[PDB]
Structure formats: structure tokens, C-alpha cells
Amino acid sequence: TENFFGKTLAARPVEAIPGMLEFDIPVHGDNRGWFKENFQKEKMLPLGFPESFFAEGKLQNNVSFSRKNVLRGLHAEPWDKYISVADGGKVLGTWVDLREGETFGNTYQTVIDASKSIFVPRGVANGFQVLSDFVAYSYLVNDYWALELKPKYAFVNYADPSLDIKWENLEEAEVSEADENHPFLKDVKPLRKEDL
Amino acid sequence: TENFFGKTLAARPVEAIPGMLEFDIPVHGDNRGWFKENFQKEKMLPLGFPESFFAEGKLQNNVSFSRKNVLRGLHAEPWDKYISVADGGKVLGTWVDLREGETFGNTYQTVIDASKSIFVPRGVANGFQVLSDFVAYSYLVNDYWALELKPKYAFVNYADPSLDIKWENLEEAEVSEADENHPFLKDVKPLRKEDL
Numbered sequence: 001t002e003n004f005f006g007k008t009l010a011a012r013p014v015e016a017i018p019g020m021l022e023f024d025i026p027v028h029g030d031n032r033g034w035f036k037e038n039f040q041k042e043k044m045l046p047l048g049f050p051e052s053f054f055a056e057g058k059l060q061n062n063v064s065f066s067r068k069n070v071l072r073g074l075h076a077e078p079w080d081k082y083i084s085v086a087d088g089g090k091v092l093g094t095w096v097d098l099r100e101g102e103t104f105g106n107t108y109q110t111v112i113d114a115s116k117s118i119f120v121p122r123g124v125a126n127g128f129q130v131l132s133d134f135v136a137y138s139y140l141v142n143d144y145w146a147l148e149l150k151p152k153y154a155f156v157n158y159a160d161p162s163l164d165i166k167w168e169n170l171e172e173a174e175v176s177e178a179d180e181n182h183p184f185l186k187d188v189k190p191l192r193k194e195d196l
Numbered sequence: 197t198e199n200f201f202g203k204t205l206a207a208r209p210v211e212a213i214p215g216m217l218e219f220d221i222p223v224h225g226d227n228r229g230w231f232k233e234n235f236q237k238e239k240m241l242p243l244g245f246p247e248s249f250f251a252e253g254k255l256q257n258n259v260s261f262s263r264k265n266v267l268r269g270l271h272a273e274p275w276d277k278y279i280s281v282a283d284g285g286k287v288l289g290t291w292v293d294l295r296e297g298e299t300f301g302n303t304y305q306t307v308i309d310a311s312k313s314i315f316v317p318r319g320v321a322n323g324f325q326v327l328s329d330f331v332a333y334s335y336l337v338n339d340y341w342a343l344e345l346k347p348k349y350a351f352v353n354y355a356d357p358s359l360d361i362k363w364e365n366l367e368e369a370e371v372s373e374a375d376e377n378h379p380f381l382k383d384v385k386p387l388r389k390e391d392l
């Protein structure tokens with residue numbers, strides 16, 4: 001459903017990217033603000049949130065704070081991600097499947113705010129562009145990043161025009177030096193089962 | 197020297213309230229805003245984050261978004277909490293130990309922004325007042341909401357003047373009806389070890 005407040009917790013797969021799940025999150029508001037169970041393990045497993053997420057006992061919660069037009073992305077590190085927005089902001093979420101197979105290069109985009117979350121399987125590149133004045137982007141992962149290991153990780157350039165995606169403002173996107181220099185899709189080695 | 201960006205991940209005890217920990221979180225700023233590892237299990241266990249948090253394999257992440265002068269709490273819920281701020285806001289965090297023993301009624305207060313987090317053991321009442329225009333307050337807990345546990349909650353009234361705490365604006369606090377009506381510390385039954 002579309003309403004911000006009072007949704008039933010529910011999940012829907014994304015047809016073009018196997019394993020991806022889009023969730024409606026219940027948010028309850030009053031005069032003071034609002035409250036959500038952003039992630040609730042017991043309730044999300046029966047909806048298809050994969051038990052394999054928890055198999056290694058690894059957990060990290062990352063948070064970024066970004067202004068309008070900031071674009072972060074296409075990142076496909078060897079871990080799963082559960083993505084959401086923790087404040088009143090919104091982003092255009094964007095995904096490109098980098099797994100070896102019939103879905104290599106498939107894409108999806110959707111607007112994320114505090115009432116929506118996304119499960120992104122390892123091997124699918126994650127990104128977003130900030131639509132609101134600012135946003136708090138909070139996500140859970142199940143393996144641990146190291147600066148030194150970044151050469152081992154998979155990335156694709158947000159600006160590669162052969163990708164079937166449309167950013168809100170490509171030309172004035174506010175980006176890192178790293179995201180400027182990631183390889184185009186044709187130079188990305190598709191991720192095999194054994195690389196994940 | 198300023199104390200928001202580029203801190204080393206570190207933990208400290210709160211002398212007055214055993215089992216509590218205050219963390220300095222590394223927040224990395226750049227042209228886009230900032231990024232933090234809000235929680236990182238592998239890096240946080242060595243600093244004393246209790247393994248008992250994970251013993252039952254339960255996990256829930258809550259978020260509340262609150263407007264200025266909102267004051268929530270003094271609630272000792274039947275589970276541990278790991279608390280932090282996910283956006284550019286700040287709160288005055290406030291704690292009152294409700295455990296049976298020599299620290300019953302002990303208090304602590306400190307300002308929490310995205311560069312700080314707090315581990316609150318079960319039995320210690322949690323609360324905050326919003327100092328910024330808005331704030332995204334994101335926390336992890338290790339059990340799930342259930343009416344079978346409501347007998348294991350304890351509450352103290354935020355405005356009991358005999359509490360060794362001071363709020364920023366008491367007079368202009370925006371408080372729920374329920375929070376207005378919690379018992380004064382005198383009329384709270386200390387939580388025993390069996391209740392956690």
C-alpha cells in the first residue's frame with residue numbers, strides 16, 4: 001500500500017532481481033512524531049526475509065546522513081543489505097544485478113522513505129539519490145567491510161549510460177571520488193556463485 | 197578540540213549505573229554529509245558490548261522520530277537497548293537505575309548525537325528529551341513486544357523532583373498522557389534479578 005502511516009507489515013519480491021524483497025513497514029504517528037519497528041526478526045522471517053542472513057552470526061548497522069542530490073552508489077560488496085530510511089527524508093533507490101546469469105544487468109528503482117525497506121542480496125549493486133533536503137539512511141549487513149579489501153569488492157559506475165536506470169539529477173549529483181571512478185558494466189566481471 | 201568527527205571507537209563505564217556503557221562512534225565526514233558504523237559486532241565485543249545481548253538470537257531495530265521539546269520516558273522495558281541518533285539531531289539522554297540493590301535510584305544524563313551511543317542493561321529506565329528541531333532516535337533491542345512481559349516493566353515519572361536529574365525545559369516538555377502518570381520513585385517496586 002501507499003499510505004505512510006498504519007501499513008500492515010508485508011513483503012513483495014522484485015520480479016527482475018531474484019531474492020530482492022520490498023517491505024511495507026508500519027509507522028505509527030502522533031503529535032510527538034512517529035515510531036516504527038524498522039526490523040523485527042520474528043515477524044520478518046515468515047514473510048521471506050532469508051534465514052541465511054543470520055547464518056554466520058555477523059551483524060553491523062551503518063548509517064549515513066546526506067543532503068539533496070547526493071548520489072551514492074552502485075556497490076555490490078559480498079554481503080547482504082537490509083536498507084531503510086530512519087528520518088523524514090526520501091531517496092530514489094536504485095539496483096543493478098551483477099550476478100552471473102540470465103539476470104546480469106537487470107535493474108529496479110523505487111522511492112524509499114521510512115515506511116518502506118528493501119532486502120538486497122549479495123551480488124546486487126546498491127545505490128540511492130537523495131530527493132528530500134536531507135536523509136538518514138540506515139541499513140543492516142551480515143559481513144564486515146575493510147578498507148584494504150575494497151579491491152576485492154564489486155562496483156559499477158552510477159553514470160554508465162548503458163544501465164537501464166534514470167537518476168533524478170545525474171549532472172548535478174553530489175558524489176565521492178570513488179563513485180566517480182568505478183568501472184562501467186562492460187568491465188565488471190559477473191559475480192559467480194563461488195564469489196558470494 | 198571538537199568531539200563529533202573522527203573519534204576513535206571507544207567504550208566507557210557509567211560508574212553510577214553498572215552494566216551501562218557509553219561509546220564514542222567514528223563519524224566520517226565528506227562532501228555528501230557523513231557515514232558511521234553505528235553498530236559493528238566484531239569491533240564492539242572487544243570493548244565490552246555484552247555477548248548476552250545475542251544469546252537468544254533475537255533482534256529488533258526501532259526508530260522514533262521526534263520533534264523539539266518532546267520528552268519520552270523513564271521506561272525500564274524487559275530487554276537490553278543499544279541507543280543512538282541516526283540524523284543530525286541531538287537529545288538529552290537520561291537514565292534511572294530501577295534494579296533492586298545498592299544502585300537503586302542512581303542516575304546518569306548525557307547529550308547524545310550521532311557520534312555517541314549507549315548500552316542500557318535491562319532494569320535501567322531509559323528516556324530522552326529532544327534538543328534539536330527534530331531527531332531520529334534509532335535503537336536495537338534483544339526481545340519482542342508482548343503482553344506476557346508487561347508485568348516485568350517498571351516506570352518512573354520524568355517529573356518526580358526528587359530524581360537526581362535535570363531536564364532542559366521541563367515547562368515546555370511535550371509528553372504523552374501515559375508518561376505524565378507514571379509512579380514517583382517512592383512507589384516503584386525495585387526490579388529483582390529474576391525479572392532481569
Ligand SMILES: Cc1cn([C@H]2C[C@H](O)[C@@H](COP(=O)(O)OP(=O)(O)O[C@H]3OC[C@@H](O)[C@H](O)[C@H]3O)O2)c(=O)[nH]c1=O
Pocket residue numbers: 028034035036037258260268269271273322323341372
Ligand atoms: C515499543 C514499541 C512500540 N510500538 C508501538 C506502540 C505505539 O502505537 C507506538 C508508539 O509507542 P508509545 O507506546 O507511544 O511509546 P513511545 O513514547 O514512542 O516510546 C518508544 O520510543 C522511545 C523509546 O525510548 C521507548 O522505550 C519506546 O517505548 O509504537 C511498537 O509497535 N513496537 C514496539 O516495540
Ligand SMILES: Cc1cn([C@H]2C[C@H](O)[C@@H](COP(=O)(O)OP(=O)(O)O[C@H]3OC[C@@H](O)[C@H](O)[C@H]3O)O2)c(=O)[nH]c1=O
Pocket residue numbers: 062064072073075077126127145176178224231232233
Ligand atoms: C562502507 C563503510 C565505509 N566506512 C567509511 C569509509 C569512508 O570514510 C566512509 C564512506 O565510505 P564510502 O565507501 O564512501 O560509503 P558510501 O558511498 O556511503 O556507501 C556505503 O553505503 C551505501 C552502501 O551500498 C555501500 O555498501 C557502503 O559502502 O565510511 C566505514 O568505516 N565502514 C564501512 O562499512
Ligand code: NI
Pocket residue numbers: none
Ligand atoms: Ni568469552
